[PDB]
Amino acid sequence: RPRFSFSIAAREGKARTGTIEMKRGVIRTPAFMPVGTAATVKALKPETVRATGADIILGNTYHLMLRPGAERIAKLGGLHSFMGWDRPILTDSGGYQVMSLSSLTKQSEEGVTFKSHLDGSRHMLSPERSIEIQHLLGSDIVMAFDECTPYPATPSRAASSMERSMRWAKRSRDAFDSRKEQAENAALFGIQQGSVFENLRQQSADALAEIGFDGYAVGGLAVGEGQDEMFRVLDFSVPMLPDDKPHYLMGVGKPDDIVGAVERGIDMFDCVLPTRSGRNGQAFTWDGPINIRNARFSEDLKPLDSECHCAVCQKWSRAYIHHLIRAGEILGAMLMTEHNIAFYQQLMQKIRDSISEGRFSQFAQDFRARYF
Amino acid sequence: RPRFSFSIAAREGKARTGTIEMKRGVIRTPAFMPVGTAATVKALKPETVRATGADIILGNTYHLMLRPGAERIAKLGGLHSFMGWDRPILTDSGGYQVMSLSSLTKQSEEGVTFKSHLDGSRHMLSPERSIEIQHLLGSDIVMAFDECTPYPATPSRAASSMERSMRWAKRSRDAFDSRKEQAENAALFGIQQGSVFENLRQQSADALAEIGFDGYAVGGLAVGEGQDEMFRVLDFSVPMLPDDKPHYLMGVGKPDDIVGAVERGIDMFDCVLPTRSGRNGQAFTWDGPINIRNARFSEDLKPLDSECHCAVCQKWSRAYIHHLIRAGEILGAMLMTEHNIAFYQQLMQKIRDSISEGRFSQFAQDFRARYF
Numbered sequence: 100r101p102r103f104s105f106s107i108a109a110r111e112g113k114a115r116t117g118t119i120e121m122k123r124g125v126i127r128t129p130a131f132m133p134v135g136t137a138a139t140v141k142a143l144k145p146e147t148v149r150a151t152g153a154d155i156i157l158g159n160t161y162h163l164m165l166r167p168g169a170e171r172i173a174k175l176g177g178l179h180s181f182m183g184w185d186r187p188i189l190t191d192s193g194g195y196q197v198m199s200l201s202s203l204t205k206q207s208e209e210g211v212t213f214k215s216h217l218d219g220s221r222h223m224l225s226p227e228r229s230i231e232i233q234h235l236l237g238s239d240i241v242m243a244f245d246e247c248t249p250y251p252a253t254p255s256r257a258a259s260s261m262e263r264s265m266r267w268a269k270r271s272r273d274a275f276d277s278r279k280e281q282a283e284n285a286a287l288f289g290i291q292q293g294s295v296f297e298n299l300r301q302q303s304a305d306a307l308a309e310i311g312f313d314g315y316a317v318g319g320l321a322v323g324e325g326q327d328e329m330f331r332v333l334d335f336s337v338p339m340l341p342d343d344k345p346h347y348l349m350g351v352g353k354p355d356d357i358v359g360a361v362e363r364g365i366d367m368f369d370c371v372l373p374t375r376s377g378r379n380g381q382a383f384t385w386d387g388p389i390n391i392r393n394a395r396f397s398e399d400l401k402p403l404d405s406e407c408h409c410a411v412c413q414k415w416s417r418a419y420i421h422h423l424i425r426a427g428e429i430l431g432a433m434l435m436t437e438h439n440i441a442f443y444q445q446l447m448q449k450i451r452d453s454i455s456e457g458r459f460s461q462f463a464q465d466f467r468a469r470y471f
Numbered sequence: 472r473p474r475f476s477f478s479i480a481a482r483e484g485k486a487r488t489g490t491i492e493m494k495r496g497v498i499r500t501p502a503f504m505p506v507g508t509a510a511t512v513k514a515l516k517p518e519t520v521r522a523t524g525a526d527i528i529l530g531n532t533y534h535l536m537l538r539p540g541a542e543r544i545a546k547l548g549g550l551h552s553f554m555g556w557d558r559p560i561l562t563d564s565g566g567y568q569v570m571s572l573s574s575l576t577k578q579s580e581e582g583v584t585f586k587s588h589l590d591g592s593r594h595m596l597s598p599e600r601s602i603e604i605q606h607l608l609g610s611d612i613v614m615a616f617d618e619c620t621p622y623p624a625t626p627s628r629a630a631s632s633m634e635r636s637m638r639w640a641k642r643s644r645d646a647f648d649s650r651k652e653q654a655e656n657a658a659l660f661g662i663q664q665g666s667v668f669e670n671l672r673q674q675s676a677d678a679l680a681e682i683g684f685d686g687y688a689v690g691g692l693a694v695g696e697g698q699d700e701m702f703r704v705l706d707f708s709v710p711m712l713p714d715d716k717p718h719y720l721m722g723v724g725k726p727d728d729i730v731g732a733v734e735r736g737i738d739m740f741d742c743v744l745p746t747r748s749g750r751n752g753q754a755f756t757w758d759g760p761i762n763i764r765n766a767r768f769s770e771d772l773k774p775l776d777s778e779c780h781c782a783v784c785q786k787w788s789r790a791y792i793h794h795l796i797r798a799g800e801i802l803g804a805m806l807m808t809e810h811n812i813a814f815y816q817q818l819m820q821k822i823r824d825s826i827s828e829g830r831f832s833q834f835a836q837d838f839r840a841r842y843f
């Protein structure tokens with residue numbers, strides 16, 4: 100396969116369905132990427148993640164540079180080898196989690212200096228270091244290092260962050276290209292910023308396209324603005340990005356958000372929702388999510404979802420998983436997670452098929468009628 | 472298959488190797504039984520437990536009567552159906568864990584009344600109720616309800632507990648037999664008591680044989696007496712039990728204890744060691760156990776054990792599992808547990824094969840030379 104090749108097979112309105120070919124595998128889009136936090140998709144062996152239908156997973160750069168270490172993972176043969184996942188891996192830049200999880204973050208034009216929320220150590224993450232860490236990890240899709248703008252943002256602050264992000268996008272591009280091995284085997288995605296302001300999003304899109312990237316992510320969303328606002332922003336933002344390249348909506352995972360995002364042109368998604376779902380009792384079903392911990396499921400012999408085809412719904416009942424979760428049993432987490440990720444992948448398959456068949460709009464309608 | 476049929480295929484000294492045929496499956500002996508505490512073998516799907524080579528698992532009656540409830544499990548179709556394990560299941564009487572984990576235990580000739588260490592509720596466990604609960608669970612091998620004697624024990628107290636246990640063994644037998652369905656489909660094991668005293672063990676063995684059971688367990692050991700004393704007691708105790716029936720050593724699981732116990736006539740074992748091992752970093756190897764959390768394994772690319780054939784040793788390195796455990800990741804527990812249970816099953820296979828081939832004594836010697 101080629102280093103990177105995105106092809107759209109079918110369309111319906113703004114929605115697209117196709118594939119991304121990379122050296123390590125083919126990615127069917129719209130795609131959902133399970134998140135591997137500390138070099139592991141929570142409570143799941145990589146073979147199980149693949150069994151759910153996943154073509155690609157996301158790796159958190161922030162956690163990896165801290166815990167085992169980027170250099171260490173490289174010495175061990177790369178993240179793929181390390182965790183046992185031989186398919187594509189998209190890695191975030193680490194920046195977003197630096198601003199969310201780390202201590203004493205000192206920001207500058209050069210990058211960001213911060214303290215670990217673990218050992219209390221110190222690191223100087225920058226566009227160059229982030230690209231380098233992602234290289235050390237052996238990432239297939241590398242995200243440009245940016246600065247996520249907090250919501251709500253004033254036009255002036257949103258402009259400054261976006262402008263800095265565009266400058267950092269150029270530095271990310273150059274860092275990526277100067278590393279021969281990485282440029283020849285991996286892909287690079289740029290990230291659009293501009294908060295909720297149309298003019299800023301347009302300037303960001305133009306700057307990104309001018310630099311040139313393999314894919315374009317819509318950043319700065321799913322940060323407290325609500326679905327209506329997110330959709331309103333996506334309405335004008337997605338059309339600004341190059342049509343022939345993948346559109347990636349970062350940190351978006353509620354089923355209804357994904358459906359609406361695909362209707363607006365998004366091809367890729369990632370979220371912790373599925374993994375953190377079965378950690379509190381939340382299991383997704385076609386009739387809406389349910390909290391397995393509720394007493395009404397103590398003697399329910401039916402599977403988590405009536406039509407889901409995952410191994411969990413084939414083999415175990417709600418009653419058993421209810422008991423497992425309430426007992427604080429690890430198997431409870433394993434089973435809940437497998438089902439949830441499988442549910443998401445089935446959602447992505449239903450989306451891809453409906454687009455390919457020109458009945459996506461009807462699917463979106465039927466999905467919402469039942470889900471809500 | 473028959474309700475119960477034990478047959479010895481080979482012998483070497485006191486050691487035996489054979490099979491127990493039951494309706495739900497064949498059990499190869501000497502056998503190691505993984506422990507399913509809250510209706511789950513910690514961090515493992517039942518298919519994975521079977522993949523390690525396990526022919527049978529143990530179910531904790533104490534935990535089950537408390538958490539989901541015996542009656543509830545029965546209404547749900549039995550423990551086998553509930554947890555997804557269709558092979559034999561041996562259930563303890565619940566008594567031992569009543570004296571170890573529960574609050575305010577009030578003992579009498581009728582049984583034991585106690586408070587739950589969970590909700591703080593109250594229950595009246597007796598030989599009749601224990602047998603009944605095990606029936607409700609759908610147990611294949613039912614353990615008689617006894618009274619484990621604390622170590623050290625005075626001759627007088629050991630005698631009183633043993634005598635009470637023999638009276639409770641008779642009540643267990645009668646309770647079991649009066650329940651047609653249970654008597655026709657399940658097996659009943661009696662438990663020998665008498666502490667470290669030879670005369671008491673002899674009286675217990677005689678009383679048990681007089682009543683008649685499908686199997687005989689050596690109870691009252693692995694309670695703080697040390698390996699030398701345990702072995703010394705087994706030396707004279709095992710020969711007192713019927714030779715043509717299975718000999719079960721309860722709560723014994725260190726690899727060296729199992730080897731020495733088999734040399735003394737034991738056919739069945741169960742222990743939490745394997746499951747609680749990979750919870751602190753302990754992984755068993757042929758060169759002795761290792762603590763995966765130790766910094767020396769951070770960049771060790773070799774598998775947990777060099778010759779182990781489990782899926783974990785085929786797919787992941789010490790370095791990865793070291794990181795997972797130190798990161799508090801669930802997959803760390805899943806991988807450590809699978810390997811440890813697989814190691815135990817391989818130990819049981821090496822024991823069975825060496826007995827069948829008349830070279831067990833040599834195996835025991837070689838095993839210890841390397842393990843220590």
Ligand SMILES: Nc1cc(N)c2c(=O)[nH][nH]c(=O)c2c1
Nearest residue numbers: 195247318319320321349350
């Ligand atoms: N919701 C979001 C999640 C993310 N991981 C990111 C990011 O990594 N970079 N930039 C972003 O804007 C962003 C937004």
Ligand SMILES: Nc1cc(N)c2c(=O)[nH][nH]c(=O)c2c1
Nearest residue numbers: 567619690691692693721722
């Ligand atoms: N070590 C032991 C573990 C056990 N689960 C038991 C038991 O269940 N009954 N009686 C016993 O003596 C005993 C001993």
Ligand SMILES: [Zn+2]
Nearest residue numbers: 407409412438
């Ligand atoms: Zn399912």
Ligand SMILES: [Zn+2]
Nearest residue numbers: 779781784810
């Ligand atoms: Zn192994």
